[PDB]
Ligand binder design. Structure first.
Ligand SMILES: *C(=O)CNC(=O)/C=N/OCC(=O)NCC(*)=O
Lengths: 25, 25
């Protein structure tokens, strides 16, 4: 692995989810 | 550096995902 770490705060509501990810495996 | 962040924005059909690209390093 995944050439992209993960950093979000979820947010379903119609299927939403602020996904602010940062580079990095 | 603290740049290069794949700032994503999982957005439901209500809109259309999103990503603010502006990494400098
Ligand atoms: C319209 O095209 C809706 N698009 C999406 O919902 C797509 N976003 O997916 C972003 C994703 O999978 N990011 C993975 C890394 O965190």
């Amino acid at each position: 692995x995944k050439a992209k770490i993960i950093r979000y705060f979820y947010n379903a509501k119609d299927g939403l989810a602020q996904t602010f990810v940062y580079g990095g495996c």
